[PDB]
Amino acid sequence: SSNIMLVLRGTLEGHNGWVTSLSTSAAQPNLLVSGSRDKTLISWRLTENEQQFGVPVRSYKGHSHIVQDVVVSADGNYAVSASWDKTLRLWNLATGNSEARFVGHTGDVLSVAIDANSSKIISASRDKTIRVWNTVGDCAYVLLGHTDWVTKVRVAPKNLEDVDDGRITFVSAGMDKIVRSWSLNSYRIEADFIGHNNYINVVQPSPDGSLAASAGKDGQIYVWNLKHKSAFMNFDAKDEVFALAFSPSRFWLTAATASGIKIYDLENEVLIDELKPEFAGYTKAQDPHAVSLAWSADGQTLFAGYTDNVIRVWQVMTAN
């Protein structure tokens, strides 16, 4: 069932480091902000005309070191960048100038998260701490509880929780081999998740906000319930799964293995497609794997940022 094929449609060249992270806003479907190892963000405007799927719009210089995680705002006009210089930068997606410079992390920041609304900034850093900031730039909360580096923090979207609660729930994980849930208004702890043999590289709540998908070094992908606080399922990737992403339309998990990109069909608990682009002049042992994955707003296109300084887009082309 669902004989869905996805074919590479364009390549977004222009970066100079590994495209570490990607982000896309639901409101604005034709804009894609990507941060790389070249200490710069790039805003891409997508064109449905011919080979190249997008067009760079603005480069955001101002970061001294590696740019690790990138997050765009809900409205699609602001972008928060986490870099390896222990600072966070807020950028206007049109002006190109920085608005706020969040400072206070003693370790280089690995991940940042946007609030569901435009209120709070959640950042994870190597200093074993999480920081909650206002949009102005000051740090409101210093959440502790992790004894090691925290690699990833992305918010669980409130879908239909009771009506309304005004409570901000997200997850955090890193080299503590644990996954933690946090709730904000106040701004304290929630349930735990301990399933990983090795350390967690990346976690990601489902688009609805009721499934949390975590991955690590051993390629053991775990799916948990947050609102039910229990495990949902478990798979093995048998390679180094660098990043993973849910899909808005389909019930899918893209996983960036060290060999290629797997897609797992969640309802059938079986992988369906494997993505391995064709390079040239290599030795098959160092083919550029994927580090960033991001689906489109509708769920029709997939952006993968590799280690060869390239974004590649796979458009869903169902060949019957």
């Binding site: 222009g14 067009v55 760079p56 480069s59 190109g96």
Partner: protein, 71 residues
Amino acid sequence: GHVSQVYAIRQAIAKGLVAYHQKFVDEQSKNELKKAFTSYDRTLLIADSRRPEPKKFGGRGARSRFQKSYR
């Protein structure tokens, strides 16, 4: 000196054009400027790495000796 100043103006004008196009114009414009520049006299956008060598005792030059007698 004179020619050093001239090369300084060269690089300054080129870098100003590139930076302005990056900041306020567009990405492709700046990339096209960089393709036109760096394909010609790379120093137009990259500062020269060569700087003078400190002098040392035992010679009138930075890396030259005075002379020997032997007799």
